[PDB]
Amino acid sequence: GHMIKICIAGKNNIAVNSLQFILKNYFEADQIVVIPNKNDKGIDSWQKSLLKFALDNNIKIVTLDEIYNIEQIIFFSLEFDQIIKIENFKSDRLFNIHFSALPKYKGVFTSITPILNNELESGVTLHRIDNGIDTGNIIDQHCFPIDINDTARDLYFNYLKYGESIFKKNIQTIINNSYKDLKQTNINSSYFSRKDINLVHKINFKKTSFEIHNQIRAFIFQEYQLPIINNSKIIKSILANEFIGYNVFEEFENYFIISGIDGFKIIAQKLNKL
């Protein structure tokens, strides 16, 4: 019977827009609490700030320890950074939106790992939180394409959009506790940790054009880093069906022309191109 009905924990446009949605449609400000990620400085930047939205709309900021004992609270992680232990919570209403098509690509850097592993599609998945990393039972999933020249950043913005949508699609059944779920399968399950990914990726050119292009574009996310080829930052990679011969590599003022062991043209655009 507590005042507080729901907690939004996490960051970025998905957390802010989902919070705004529930404030507009389901709960009053005094029924909601927020746990921003540790790094949230309260500044709207290339993403909206959850801390800023809470402060601007009179939504209380809390810690996990403040909400553990709240009976029946709905806890939603939307890019939240702390692993929870479910036995801390009195409530069993604990949910996450994970930026992959589970069971594939559990873990981190999920705007990098599907592209680096040659996928043509990804997804967002709403699931129950259990004590493992993105291992809980799936409630809903939406799969969508990774277009051939999408960068990690382009994929991330698609996760924000489709994740916000799957939140809205499912929130009423979460609130009325009538949702259905299904155990994740063992097969196809994959996982990457921060140690598995070197963000300063050294490209293996003894690979197909599709693999070289994926090795480039998986690391294009300018707020964090850009790939460097021959001491030049790369902002875009374009893969064509044109055969140009095997193992081409040529540097120009504004781009590189590259092909791998199957000979298909890649244009890797330098950041300095006007």
Ligand X SMILES: Cc1cn([C@H]2C[C@H](O)[C@@H](COP(=O)(O)OP(=O)(O)O)O2)c(=O)[nH]c1=O
Ligand Y SMILES: Nc1nc(=O)c2c([nH]1)NC[C@@H](CNc1ccc(C(=O)N[C@@H](CCC(=O)O)C(=O)O)cc1)N2C=O
Interface residues with Cl ion (CB under 5 A) are 63-64, 84-85, 88, 103, 128, 130, 136-137, 184-185
User: CA-CA distance, 42 to 93, in Å (whole number)?
Assistant: 28
Strands 32-36 and 6-10: parallel
Which residues in this chain contact ligand Y in the complex, by CB under 6 A? 77, 80-84, 96, 98, 107-108, 129, 131, 133-134, 193-195
We find the least distance from the C-beta atom of residue 92 to ligand Y, in angstroms, to be: 13
**Among ligand X, Cl ion, its own copies, none, what does residue 168 contact (CB within 5–8 Å per kind)?**
none
Residue 88 in the binding site for its own copies (CB under 8 A): no
Residue 11 in the binding site for its own copies (CB under 8 A): no
User: CA-CA distance, 209 to 190, in Å (whole number)?
Assistant: 24
How many other C-beta atoms lie within 10 A of the C-beta of residue 55?
Answer: 14
| Sequence letter at residue 237 | S
Which residues in this chain contact ligand X in the complex, by CB under 6 A? 79, 108-112, 152, 156, 199, 221, 224-225
**Among Cl ion, ligand X, its own copies, none, what does residue 88 contact (CB within 5–8 Å per kind)?**
Cl ion
**Among Cl ion, its own copies, ligand Y, none, what does residue 11 contact (CB within 5–8 Å per kind)?**
none
Nearer to ligand Y, 115 or 235 (CB): 115
CB 128 within 8 A of CB 140: no
User: CA-CA distance, 71 to 81, in Å (whole number)?
Assistant: 23
User: CA-CA distance, 174 to 94, in Å (whole number)?
Assistant: 10
